[PDB]
Amino acid sequence: MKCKICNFDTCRAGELKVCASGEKYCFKESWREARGTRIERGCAATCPKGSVYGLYVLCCTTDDCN
């Protein structure tokens, strides 16, 4: 149960690790700004959203998405 972490549109990390051990999953989001968006990764159990800014949120589990 591992998860590959990388920045879309600029895969500069591409580092995979472990986290999905039971009640945990990977969370991938994208914060907006005005001259370029920033995709953030990390594995946990909280998948918050956005609106006042316009960030993207996407969680995953099982095979990589773990």
Side-chain angles (χ1 to χ4, degrees):
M1 306 213 59
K2 307 142 92 152
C3 190
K4 189 162 116 145
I5 286 167
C6 208
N7 201 313
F8 243 40
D9 217 90
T10 168
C11 239
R12 283 199 304 185
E15 287 198 281
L16 169 147
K17 47 146 68 146
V18 286
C19 241
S21 200
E23 271 248 337
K24 267 156 250 249
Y25 58 70
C26 241
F27 177 37
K28 268 89 99 90
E29 50 141 344
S30 172
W31 219 270
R32 241 194 72 150
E33 171 193 282
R35 264 116 111 143
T37 70
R38 262 266 151 152
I39 281 135
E40 240 131 297
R41 311 128 239 160
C43 56
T46 58
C47 266
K49 242 227 151 178
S51 32
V52 172
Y53 276 59
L55 70 92
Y56 208 109
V57 288
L58 200 158
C59 320
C60 241
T61 187
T62 328
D63 199 317
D64 256 82
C65 269
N66 267 323

